[PDB]
Design a protein around this ligand. Structure first.
Ligand SMILES: OC1(CNc2ncnc3[nH]ccc23)CCCCC1
Ligand SMILES: [Cl-]
Length: 167
């Protein structure tokens, strides 16, 4: 039993809700919140900009030190950093950016990072401002993630579409 409330069960291990991941994080304080990161950990907009704003820019300050030490992430890769006031940890995961010509096959690699964590609050990677179809992101999620994932979908219209077309 966990404290996620109001989620629609989609499969054995995937749950979904129309919500802002920032608000879900502030209410639940999960062990792991997933950020829809880019390779430079520049949290300007979308999920990343919203999460970083909620940390009063502490996420960005920590991220800049991470990059200065380690260099950029790989597309499909991830790193674990602090969750600040939103979660214990933030798993920064880089899905491919369709607008940059990046390989959508890397979306599966991106979701594989979730399997290193027993329970996560997460967005549909590569969707939103990253350019991919959220319906596709959801199918890759369900077919790749084996740990327990709670998805927060920001847009009500797309959520209803994601639910309606699922089975
Ligand atoms: O959910 C997405 C990605 N974008 C966000 N998701 C959750 N919470 C958020 N807070 C700010 C942005 C944001 C991907 C699926 C279709 C709708 C948009
Ligand atoms: Cl977005």
């Amino acid at each position: 039993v966990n404290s996620f409330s109001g989620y629609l069960k989609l499969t054995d291990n995937v749950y979904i809700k129309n919500a802002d991941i920032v608000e879900e994080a502030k209410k639940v304080k999960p062990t792991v919140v997933v950020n829809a990161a880019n390779v430079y950990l520049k949290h300007g907009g979308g999920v990343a900009g919203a999460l970083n704003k909620a940390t009063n820019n502490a996420m960005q300050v920590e991220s800049d030190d991470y990059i200065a030490t380690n260099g950029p992430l790989k597309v499909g890769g991830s790193c674990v950093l602090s969750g600040h006031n939103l979660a214990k940890h933030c798993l920064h995961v880089v899905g491919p950016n369709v607008n940059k010509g990046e390989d959508i096959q890397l979306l599966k690699s991106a979701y594989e990072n979730f399997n290193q964590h027993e329970v996560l609050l997460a967005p549909l990677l590569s969707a939103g401002i990253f350019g991919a179809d959220p319906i596709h992101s959801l199918r890759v999620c369900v077919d790749t993630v084996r740990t327990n994932v709670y998805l927060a979908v920001f847009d009500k219209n797309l959520y209803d579409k994601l639910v309606s077309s699922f089975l």
